[PDB]
């Protein structure tokens, strides 16, 4: 669970066991906390490369 | 007392509460039905000091009381207050505080990232980001003020900004290792 | 008491000088030069004064002590206080250790955090036994949030409704 | 009794002892929050 890492917030898996996780197209796993935190900061970019 | 309820009731009384609350609980673990005059002669406490400690546990919905109205050998009314560890309420009281302590950090952090990010180090005026269209000077490329022509800076680096948020967010994760020994036992 | 308080004072003071042996009654009136007190006062304080004492100890033909029943030993403060926890006999005040054990400020500080202290309103300390099998401590700011949650002005069945609403 | 309100219970079924405790100001605040709109019209008050 916490071994795969976390993009922006990094502090979400240790706060709620029943966490709502999401996937994309390039091949990553972003939880619901990183969806709203990245939209208010940027948009829908890949944290490693560049996937719109 | 089971091995899970005995170990959980000892770790909470030491770290959270003080030392006086933990010394008066060790007798309650080894002996359940304990008279009122027994916790004063064994602990060697005071009549006003022991009463203040027992009231904190009873007020926190931990232990109860069972009064008795009988007759002693002298012929007077003898009243006793049997204090014992009641697990019929302490289970939900501990879980009640865990939900507020976990949401208190989330509330104080969410209400601190969205504030401001502009302040003039001369007139000491806290500016916001919704006034950058009027506080800009095209003849210099920098920002200014209102009643004066001074250069602004940041906004006192102490709030979770783009980089300082990681330092304050990881503080909440430190509660898990220090409480994993207590949460796994209760789970 | 006035006569009984004087006998107990000289019985314990002389023991701390360098005499470790039981004593009777004729030895006190002879060493203190108080033999000329009469015959009616010597017999009255023999079979009534030392008999009414509930804490007196008679070995054979002499008299022992009463404030302390254990023998003198180096490694004895930790073993004596440990029996009060495994059996539940209570505790020993600080005035009892400082009186029976000479210079108790060295043995207590040498053990470290093995004995907890109690702050009493009448300026008294209580010596217990800190169990090392269960130890837990947090920061100073962590104990403030634990007591900030108001749980005294609520209800037992009211807490169950708030926990079942979230999911726990 | 001046500036402090008291309460005296008397349940002649399972608790004949008259309980007397000081009414905490935080107790009446939690009850008033549960009052909805349909209950304010009875007392003669308007939530808005
Ligand atoms: Zn995340
Ligand atoms: Zn990618
Ligand atoms: Zn300015």
From Swiss-Prot, chain A:
Tissue specificity statement from the Swiss-Prot or TrEMBL entry: Highest levels in colon and testis. Moderate levels are present thymus, prostate, ovary, and small intestine. The lowest levels are found in spleen and leukocytes.
Residues that bear N-acetylmethionine: 1
Subcellular location: Nucleus
Zinc finger map (RING-type): 6-50
Residues where Phosphothreonine is found: 51
Subunit structure, interactors included: Associates primarily with CDK7 and cyclin H to form the CAK complex. CAK can further associate with the core-TFIIH to form the TFIIH basal transcription factor.
Function: Stabilizes the cyclin H-CDK7 complex to form a functional CDK-activating kinase (CAK) enzymatic complex. CAK activates the cyclin-associated kinases CDK1, CDK2, CDK4 and CDK6 by threonine phosphorylation. CAK complexed to the core-TFIIH basal transcription factor activates RNA polymerase II by serine phosphorylation of the repetitive C-terminal domain (CTD) of its large subunit (POLR2A), allowing its escape from the promoter and elongation of the transcripts. Involved in cell cycle control and in RNA transcription by RNA polymerase II.
Protein name per UniProt: CDK-activating kinase assembly factor MAT1
Gene field: MNAT1
Residue span relative to the full protein: 1 to 52 of 309
From Swiss-Prot, chain B:
HTH TFE/IIEalpha-type domain mapped to chain residues: 5-95
Subcellular location: Nucleus
Zn-finger segments (C4-type): 120-148
Top-level taxon of the source organism: Eukaryota
N6-acetyllysine modification, residue list: 58
Binding site for Zn(2+): 120, 123, 145, 148
Quaternary structure, from the entry: Tetramer of two alpha and two beta chains. Interacts with TAF6/TAFII80. Interacts with ATF7IP. Interacts with SND1. Part of TBP-based Pol II pre-initiation complex (PIC), in which Pol II core assembles with general transcription factors and other specific initiation factors including GTF2E1, GTF2E2, GTF2F1, GTF2F2, TCEA1, ERCC2, ERCC3, GTF2H2, GTF2H3, GTF2H4, GTF2H5, GTF2A1, GTF2A2, GTF2B and TBP; this large multi-subunit PIC complex mediates DNA unwinding and targets Pol II core to the transcription start site where the first phosphodiester bond forms. (Microbial infection) Interacts with varicella-zoster virus IE63 protein.
Role: Recruits TFIIH to the initiation complex and stimulates the RNA polymerase II C-terminal domain kinase and DNA-dependent ATPase activities of TFIIH. Both TFIIH and TFIIE are required for promoter clearance by RNA polymerase.
Family to which the UniProt record says this protein belongs: Belongs to the TFIIE alpha subunit family.
Protein name, as recorded: General transcription factor IIE subunit 1
Residues of the full protein shown: 10 to 196 of 439
Curated annotation (Swiss-Prot), chain C:
Location(s) in or outside the cell: Nucleus
DNA-binding region: 1-72
GO MF term list: DNA binding; RNA binding; RNA polymerase II general transcription initiation factor activity
Keyword Phosphoprotein: yes
GO CC annotation: cytosol; nucleoplasm; transcription factor TFIID complex; transcription factor TFIIE complex
KW Cell cycle (keyword) present: no
GO biological processes: transcription by RNA polymerase II; transcription initiation at RNA polymerase II promoter
Mutagenesis or variant effect for residue 113 to Y: In TTD6; reduction in the levels of both TFIIE-alpha and TFIIE-beta subunits of the TFIIE complex in patient cells; reduced phosphorylation of TFIIE-alpha observed in patient cells
Keywords for this protein: Acetylation, Disease variant, DNA-binding, Nucleus, Phosphoprotein, Transcription, Transcription regulation
TM regions (residue ranges): none
Main location: nucleus
Disease: Trichothiodystrophy 6, non-photosensitive: A form of trichothiodystrophy, a disease characterized by sulfur-deficient brittle hair and multisystem variable abnormalities. The spectrum of clinical features varies from mild disease with only hair involvement to severe disease with cutaneous, neurologic and profound developmental defects. Ichthyosis, intellectual and developmental disabilities, decreased fertility, abnormal characteristics at birth, ocular abnormalities, short stature, and infections are common manifestations.
Family: Belongs to the TFIIE beta subunit family.
Protein name per Swiss-Prot or TrEMBL: Transcription initiation factor IIE subunit beta
Span of the entire protein shown here: 75 to 242 of 291
Swiss-Prot record, chain D:
Family as reported in the entry's similarity comment: Belongs to the RNA polymerase beta' chain family.
Organism per entry: Homo sapiens
Role of this protein: Catalytic core component of RNA polymerase II (Pol II), a DNA-dependent RNA polymerase which synthesizes mRNA precursors and many functional non-coding RNAs using the four ribonucleoside triphosphates as substrates. Pol II-mediated transcription cycle proceeds through transcription initiation, transcription elongation and transcription termination stages. RNA-dependent RNA polymerase that catalyzes the extension of a non-coding RNA (ncRNA) at the 3'-end using the four ribonucleoside triphosphates as substrates. An internal ncRNA sequence near the 3'-end serves as a template in a single-round Pol II-mediated RNA polymerization reaction. May decrease the stability of ncRNAs that repress Pol II-mediated gene transcription.
Domain notes: The C-terminal domain (CTD) serves as a platform for assembly of factors that regulate transcription initiation, elongation, termination and mRNA processing. The trigger loop allows entry of NTPs into the active site, switching between an open and closed state with each NTP addition cycle.
Gene for this chain: POLR2A
Identification of the protein by name: DNA-directed RNA polymerase II subunit RPB1
Annotated positions of the Phosphoserine modification: 24
């Amino acid at each position: 669970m916490d071994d795969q890492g976390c993009p922006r917030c990094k502090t979400t898996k240790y706060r709620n066991p029943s966490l709502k996780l999401m996937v994309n197209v390039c091949g990553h796993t972003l939880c619901e906390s990183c969806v709203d935190l990245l939209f208010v900061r940027g948009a829908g970019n890949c944290p490693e490369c560049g996937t719109p | 007392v089971p091995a899970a309820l005995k170990r959980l009731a000892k770790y909470v009384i030491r770290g959270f509460y003080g030392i006086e609350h933990a010394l008066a609980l060790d007798i309650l673990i080894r002996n359940s039905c304990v008279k009122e005059e027994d916790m004063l002669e064994l602990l060697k406490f005071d009549r006003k000091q022991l009463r203040s400690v027992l009231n904190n546990l009873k007020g926190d919905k931990f232990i109860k009381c069972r009064m008795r109205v009988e007759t002693a050998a002298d012929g007077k009314t003898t009243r006793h207050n049997y204090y014992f560890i009641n697990y019929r309420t302490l289970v939900n009281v501990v879980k009640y505080k865990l939900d507020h302590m976990r949401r208190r950090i989330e509330t104080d952090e969410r209400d601190s990232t969205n504030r401001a990010s502009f302040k003039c180090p001369v007139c000491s005026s806290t500016f916001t980001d919704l006034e950058a269209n009027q506080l800009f000077d095209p003849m210099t490329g920098t920002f200014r003020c209102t009643f004066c022509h001074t250069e602004v800076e940041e906004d006192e680096s102490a709030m979770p900004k783009k980089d300082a948020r990681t330092l304050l967010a990881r503080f909440n994760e430190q509660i898990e290792p220090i409480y994993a020994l207590l949460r796994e036992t209760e789970d | 008491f006035g006569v009984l308080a004087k006998i107990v004072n000289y019985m314990k003071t002389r023991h701390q000088r360098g005499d470790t042996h039981p004593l009777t009654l004729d030895e006190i009136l002879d060493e203190t030069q108080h033999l000329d007190i009469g015959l009616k006062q010597k017999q009255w304080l023999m079979t009534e004064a030392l008999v009414n004492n509930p804490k007196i100890e008679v070995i054979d033909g002499k008299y022992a002590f009463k404030p302390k029943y254990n023998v003198r030993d180096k490694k004895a403060l930790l073993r004596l206080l440990d029996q009060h926890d495994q059996r539940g006999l209570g505790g020993i005040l600080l005035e009892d250790i400082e009186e029976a054990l000479p210079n108790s400020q060295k043995a207590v500080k040498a053990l470290g955090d093995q004995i907890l202290f109690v702050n009493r309103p009448d300026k008294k300390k209580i010596l217990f036994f800190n169990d090392k099998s269960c130890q837990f401590s947090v920061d100073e700011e962590f104990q403030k949030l634990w007591r900030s949650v108001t749980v005294d002005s609520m209800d037992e069945e009211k807490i169950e409704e708030y926990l079942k609403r979230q999911g726990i | 009794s001046g500036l402090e309100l008291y309460a005296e219970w008397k349940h002649v079924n399972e608790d004949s002892q008259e309980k007397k405790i000081l009414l905490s100001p935080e107790r009446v605040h939690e009850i008033f929050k549960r009052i909805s709109d349909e209950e304010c019209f009875v007392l003669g008050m308007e939530p808005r």
